[PDB]
Amino acid sequence: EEEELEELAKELEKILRDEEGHLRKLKEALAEGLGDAEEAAELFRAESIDEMKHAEELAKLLKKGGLDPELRELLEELAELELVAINQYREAAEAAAEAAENGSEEARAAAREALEEALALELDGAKLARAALEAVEKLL
């Protein structure tokens, strides 16, 4: 029982580190304004694939048995948070792609709102991965 929790705790550690990374790169784009719209559009598309990997690992562990009821709910909440983040990453990438081709002032503000909304979802993603890793550490 201990070594299936250890591997699981290794997973939240990777997810937690990846979330803390996306946090900083997102404010960096926020600091640079739009900068190169292609920069943000290429960055969003890559990080949505990162959240892709996270939700897939969690679902495989969610199919496992013997999980503590409270631990399963935190993983279920995180997996839900990942799918909504993959959404907002796509809405922000398309708004940055429309701003790159057009120079549109509306596609600019729309890419910034979707950037800011993706940032708020990333704060709670790291917070949920922190609380989940803390619960597993208590079980160990």
Residue numbers in the entry: 1 to 140
Which of the paper's sentences describe this entry?
In the training of recent versions of RosettaFold, a subset of positions in the input multiple sequence alignment (MSA) are masked and the network is trained to recover this missing sequence information in addition to predicting structure. This ability to recover both sequence and structural information provides a second solution to the functional site scaffolding problem: given a functional site description, a forward pass through the network can be used to complete, or “inpaint”, both protein sequence and structure in a missing/masked region of protein. Di-iron sites are important in biological systems for iron storage and can mediate catalysis. We were able to recapitulate the di-iron site from E. coli bacterioferritin, composed of four parallel helical segments, to sub-angstrom AF-RMSD using both inpainting and hallucination (the latter were not tested due to buried polar residues). The designs had diverse helix connectivities and low structural similarity to the parent (TM-score 0.55–0.71 to 1BCF_A). We chose 96 inpainted designs to test experimentally, and found that 76 had soluble expression, at least 8 had a spectroscopic shift indicative of Co2+-binding (a proxy for iron binding), and 3 (dife_inp_1–3) had CD spectra consistent with the designed fold and were stabilized by metal binding. Mutation of the metal binding residues abolished binding, and titration analysis of dife_inp_1 suggested that both metal binding sites were successfully scaffolded.
